[PDB]
Design an enzyme around this catalytic site. Structure first.
Site, mmCIF file in Angstrom:
data_model
loop_
_atom_site.group_PDB
_atom_site.id
_atom_site.type_symbol
_atom_site.label_atom_id
_atom_site.label_comp_id
_atom_site.label_asym_id
_atom_site.label_seq_id
_atom_site.Cartn_x
_atom_site.Cartn_y
_atom_site.Cartn_z
ATOM 1 N N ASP A 70 34.206 44.266 46.243
ATOM 2 C CA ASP A 70 33.389 45.433 45.872
ATOM 3 C C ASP A 70 32.793 46.085 47.106
ATOM 4 O OD1 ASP A 70 32.275 46.745 43.444
ATOM 5 O OD2 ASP A 70 30.322 46.206 44.371
ATOM 6 N N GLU A 79 37.596 47.491 47.900
ATOM 7 C CA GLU A 79 37.240 48.769 47.241
ATOM 8 C C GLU A 79 36.494 49.645 48.245
ATOM 9 O OE1 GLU A 79 33.784 49.477 45.377
ATOM 10 O OE2 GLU A 79 34.545 51.027 43.990
HETATM 11 C C1 LIG Z 1 30.484 53.239 41.300
HETATM 12 C C2 LIG Z 1 30.890 53.360 42.740
HETATM 13 O O1 LIG Z 1 29.844 54.039 43.471
HETATM 14 C C3 LIG Z 1 30.177 54.345 44.804
HETATM 15 O O2 LIG Z 1 31.281 55.230 44.886
HETATM 16 C C4 LIG Z 1 31.016 56.575 45.234
HETATM 17 C C5 LIG Z 1 31.764 56.914 46.489
HETATM 18 O O3 LIG Z 1 31.309 56.071 47.584
HETATM 19 C C6 LIG Z 1 31.513 58.379 46.846
HETATM 20 O O4 LIG Z 1 32.219 58.707 48.059
HETATM 21 C C7 LIG Z 1 31.919 59.303 45.737
HETATM 22 O O5 LIG Z 1 33.382 59.228 45.639
HETATM 23 C C8 LIG Z 1 34.020 60.547 45.727
HETATM 24 C C9 LIG Z 1 35.197 60.339 46.665
HETATM 25 O O6 LIG Z 1 34.736 59.924 47.974
HETATM 26 C C10 LIG Z 1 35.978 61.595 46.820
HETATM 27 O O7 LIG Z 1 37.088 61.386 47.695
HETATM 28 C C11 LIG Z 1 36.430 62.038 45.445
HETATM 29 O O8 LIG Z 1 37.002 63.321 45.500
HETATM 30 O O9 LIG Z 1 35.228 62.248 44.597
HETATM 31 C C12 LIG Z 1 34.560 61.007 44.407
HETATM 32 C C13 LIG Z 1 33.475 61.202 43.391
HETATM 33 O O10 LIG Z 1 32.482 62.046 43.905
HETATM 34 O O11 LIG Z 1 31.281 58.873 44.542
HETATM 35 C C14 LIG Z 1 31.520 57.535 44.104
HETATM 36 C C15 LIG Z 1 30.838 57.282 42.802
HETATM 37 O O12 LIG Z 1 29.471 57.582 42.866
HETATM 38 C C16 LIG Z 1 30.460 53.089 45.603
HETATM 39 O O13 LIG Z 1 30.883 53.457 46.900
HETATM 40 C C17 LIG Z 1 31.511 52.235 44.917
HETATM 41 O O14 LIG Z 1 31.596 51.019 45.660
HETATM 42 C C18 LIG Z 1 31.121 52.033 43.465
HETATM 43 N N1 LIG Z 1 32.124 51.105 42.822
HETATM 44 C C19 LIG Z 1 31.796 49.580 42.756
HETATM 45 C C20 LIG Z 1 30.341 49.232 42.830
HETATM 46 C C21 LIG Z 1 29.563 48.791 41.854
HETATM 47 C C22 LIG Z 1 28.242 48.174 42.134
HETATM 48 O O15 LIG Z 1 28.478 46.747 42.353
HETATM 49 C C23 LIG Z 1 30.052 48.689 40.465
HETATM 50 O O16 LIG Z 1 29.156 49.370 39.525
HETATM 51 C C24 LIG Z 1 28.266 48.534 38.779
HETATM 52 O O17 LIG Z 1 26.930 48.925 39.047
HETATM 53 C C25 LIG Z 1 26.652 50.271 38.682
HETATM 54 C C26 LIG Z 1 25.254 50.560 39.229
HETATM 55 O O18 LIG Z 1 24.338 49.675 38.687
HETATM 56 C C27 LIG Z 1 26.771 50.397 37.147
HETATM 57 O O19 LIG Z 1 26.421 51.768 36.829
HETATM 58 C C28 LIG Z 1 26.113 52.044 35.389
HETATM 59 O O20 LIG Z 1 24.848 51.448 35.010
HETATM 60 C C29 LIG Z 1 23.689 51.977 35.678
HETATM 61 C C30 LIG Z 1 22.506 51.204 35.062
HETATM 62 C C31 LIG Z 1 23.638 53.506 35.534
HETATM 63 N N2 LIG Z 1 22.458 54.072 36.256
HETATM 64 C C32 LIG Z 1 22.220 53.694 37.746
HETATM 65 C C33 LIG Z 1 22.827 54.689 38.710
HETATM 66 C C34 LIG Z 1 22.088 55.552 39.443
HETATM 67 C C35 LIG Z 1 22.684 56.535 40.420
HETATM 68 O O21 LIG Z 1 23.988 56.149 40.790
HETATM 69 C C36 LIG Z 1 20.590 55.672 39.304
HETATM 70 O O22 LIG Z 1 20.243 57.078 39.193
HETATM 71 C C37 LIG Z 1 20.054 54.861 38.113
HETATM 72 O O23 LIG Z 1 18.612 54.748 38.208
HETATM 73 C C38 LIG Z 1 20.738 53.494 38.016
HETATM 74 O O24 LIG Z 1 20.136 52.661 37.013
HETATM 75 C C39 LIG Z 1 24.935 54.153 36.033
HETATM 76 O O25 LIG Z 1 24.894 55.555 35.863
HETATM 77 C C40 LIG Z 1 26.121 53.562 35.265
HETATM 78 O O26 LIG Z 1 27.353 54.111 35.707
HETATM 79 C C41 LIG Z 1 28.221 50.092 36.785
HETATM 80 O O27 LIG Z 1 28.426 50.058 35.355
HETATM 81 C C42 LIG Z 1 28.603 48.719 37.291
HETATM 82 O O28 LIG Z 1 30.001 48.484 37.032
HETATM 83 C C43 LIG Z 1 31.406 49.360 40.308
HETATM 84 O O29 LIG Z 1 31.940 49.076 38.993
HETATM 85 C C44 LIG Z 1 32.301 48.921 41.445
HETATM 86 O O30 LIG Z 1 33.679 49.147 41.278
#
Ligand SMILES: C[C@H]1O[C@H](O[C@H]2[C@H](O)[C@@H](O)[C@@H](O[C@H]3[C@H](O)[C@@H](O)[C@H](O)O[C@@H]3CO)O[C@@H]2CO)[C@H](O)[C@@H](O)[C@@H]1N[C@H]1C=C(CO)[C@@H](O[C@H]2O[C@H](CO)[C@@H](O[C@H]3O[C@H](C)[C@@H](N[C@H]4C=C(CO)[C@@H](O)[C@H](O)[C@H]4O)[C@H](O)[C@H]3O)[C@H](O)[C@H]2O)[C@H](O)[C@H]1O
Ligand SMILES: *[C@@H]1O[C@H](CO)[C@@H](O)[C@H](O)[C@H]1NC(C)=O
Ligand SMILES: [Ca+2]
Length: 438
Positions: free
Chosen positions: A190, A214
């Site tokens: 991750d 990732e």
């Molecule tokens: C998820 C992902 O996030 C990051 O990725 C970024 C990326 O780094 C950015 O560059 C961009 O990507 C661009 C890309 O670069 C471009 O080329 C392309 O064109 O466009 C994209 C999109 O713009 O954005 C992405 C996504 O934001 C990280 O870099 C990446 O490693 C991540 N994937 C990993 C990581 C985790 C964490 O271990 C796993 O996610 C798990 O944890 C999250 C967070 O807790 C959970 O999220 C759900 O539940 C939350 C409670 C909810 N609310 C929280 C989020 C907030 C803001 O982000 C706060 O506002 C709030 O207060 C928090 O409580 C989330 O909304 C909800 O989604 C996941 O469920 C959980 O799985 C990933 O699964 C893993 O693969």
């Protein structure tokens, strides 16, 4: 297992809480944001279902004890304790042993970057149990790479201080001990972009197995350098090209240009993990509700250069949108092996796919709406016309298919014979054509 041993694998990615239940209920889960009850025995009970589609590896959720609501595993509390929701230590060992007995690998998802959220800064019961073990809380500016590394993912996941040697050593022991205790064959790492890149080689060395990292980013010039540290990366650059072509009608030069960009930027494209769906993106059918286009995307994903990954529930036509709607429970499907996409994936991933000494020739014919490549001895022809299409297609066959060779498509049983270095055939319902020599 090392990279060489993973080259010809095909991975089924599952979310442990959502795959299978040991109590055999088929009942729906009413809250996809909290635990739904999946467990290891629920996976073990369905290894025949997974293997029957041709998968020879599974990627499971992270395993440690999580903070409240961490059904996905990514919110570790004590890294050295198991998440009791998923089952016993003996059940995890039994799943791995059963997978190995079927010739399958098990890949563990691992987090080194962060813990789960701590209520009011109380790091009671966390592996890293004092606020000084974490970087100061701040919001990431994704245009500042040091911010990406030092600030807190989701502005609430406590960012472990990976610049402290005692903590680095602890993270090494955590991953080494998971791998050796449970006999995992690989890891999916991750949050790779969120720790200084030079940390990662030591971390993979500690793990002692093949790692696919990732780096969530579409720019190959940003992702590619990470392969100096890690054996493999998740192929986010190709993901966007696949979605553009098959869900948004881009011409296939989008894919041929991206394949060139990957070759330019990654020391070993052959071990990058190819995907068209995962837990962080709305499922393909939520974006473009066209089964023929999805089948084409899946044929490309599974058979192109790399190590393919299919996201659980693809084979039952799951279509949920943004998280948590793309973490549906699988057990409502009752593991139907007669599902349209189960049967299709079995053809592509069991029948056609090369399971040892995989070889691919890309760009055998790059058209606007068609694309041909070879996979083993097979000529794979994909298209983005759409469902219902019966267009005549002509493609070059490349250097290894002789004139007069009879080819039979495994998907629709279309027959075509090579003439003058080409085949011509009519599409069936816009489907991909997987031509196997007679
Ligand atoms: C998820 C992902 O996030 C990051 O990725 C970024 C990326 O780094 C950015 O560059 C961009 O990507 C661009 C890309 O670069 C471009 O080329 C392309 O064109 O466009 C994209 C999109 O713009 O954005 C992405 C996504 O934001 C990280 O870099 C990446 O490693 C991540 N994937 C990993 C990581 C985790 C964490 O271990 C796993 O996610 C798990 O944890 C999250 C967070 O807790 C959970 O999220 C759900 O539940 C939350 C409670 C909810 N609310 C929280 C989020 C907030 C803001 O982000 C706060 O506002 C709030 O207060 C928090 O409580 C989330 O909304 C909800 O989604 C996941 O469920 C959980 O799985 C990933 O699964 C893993 O693969
Ligand atoms: C970049 O991010 C780092 C880490 O958060 C921060 O200290 C630094 O001030 C940032 N640079 C700028 C110009 O804001
Ligand atoms: Ca970090």
């Amino acid at each position: 297992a090392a990279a060489a041993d993973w080259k010809s694998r095909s991975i089924y990615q599952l979310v442990t809480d959502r795959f299978g239940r040991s109590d055999g209920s088929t009942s729906a889960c009413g809250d996809l944001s909290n635990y739904c009850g999946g467990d290891y025995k629920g996976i073990q009970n369905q290894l025949d279902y997974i293997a029957g589609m041709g998968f020879d590896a599974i990627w499971i959720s992270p395993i440690p004890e999580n903070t409240d609501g961490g059904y996905h595993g990514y919110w570790a509390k004590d890294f050295e304790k198991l998440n009791t929701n998923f089952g016993s230590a003996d059940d995890l060992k039994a799943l791995v042993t059963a997978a190995h007995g079927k010739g399958m690998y098990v890949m563990l998802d691992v987090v080194a970057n962060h813990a789960g959220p701590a209520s009011g800064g109380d790091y009671s019961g966390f592996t890293f149990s004092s606020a000084s073990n974490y970087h100061p809380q701040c919001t990431i500016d994704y245009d500042n790479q040091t911010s990406v590394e030092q600030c807190w993912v989701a502005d609430d996941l406590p960012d472990i201080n990976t610049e402290d040697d005692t903590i680095v050593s602890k993270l090494h022991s955590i991953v080494s001990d998971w791998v050796t205790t449970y006999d995992f064959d690989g890891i999916r790492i991750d949050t790779v972009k969120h720790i200084r890149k030079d940390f990662w080689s030591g971390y993979e060395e500690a793990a002692g197995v093949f790692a696919t990292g990732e780096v969530f980013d579409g720019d190959a010039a940003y992702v590619g350098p990470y392969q100096d540290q890690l054996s493999s990366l998740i192929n986010y650059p190709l993901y966007y090209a696949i979605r553009d072509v098959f869900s948004a009608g881009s011409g296939f030069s989008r894919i041929s240009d991206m394949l060139s960009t990957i070759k330019s930027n990654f020391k070993d494209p052959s071990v990058l993990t190819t995907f068209v769906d995962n837990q962080d993106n709305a499922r393909f059918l939520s974006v473009k509700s066209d089964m023929s286009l999805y089948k084409n995307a899946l044929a490309f994903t599974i058979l192109t250069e790399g190590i393919p990954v299919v996201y659980y529930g693809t084979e039952q036509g799951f279509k949920g949108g943004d998280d948590p709607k793309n973490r549906e429970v699988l057990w409502t499907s009752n593991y139907d092996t007669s599902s349209d996409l189960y049967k299709f994936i079995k053809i592509v991933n069991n029948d056609v796919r090369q399971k040892s000494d995989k070889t691919v020739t890309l760009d055998v014919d790059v058209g606007t709406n068609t694309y041909a490549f070879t996979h083993g001895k097979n000529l794979i022809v994909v298209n983005n016309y759409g469902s219902g299409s019966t267009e005549s297609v002509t493609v070059k066959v490349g250097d290894s298919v002789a004139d007069g060779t009879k080819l039979v498509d495994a998907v629709s049983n279309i027959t075509a014979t090579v003439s003058g270095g080409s085949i011509t055939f009519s599409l069936k319902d816009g489907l991909p054509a997987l031509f196997v020599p007679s």
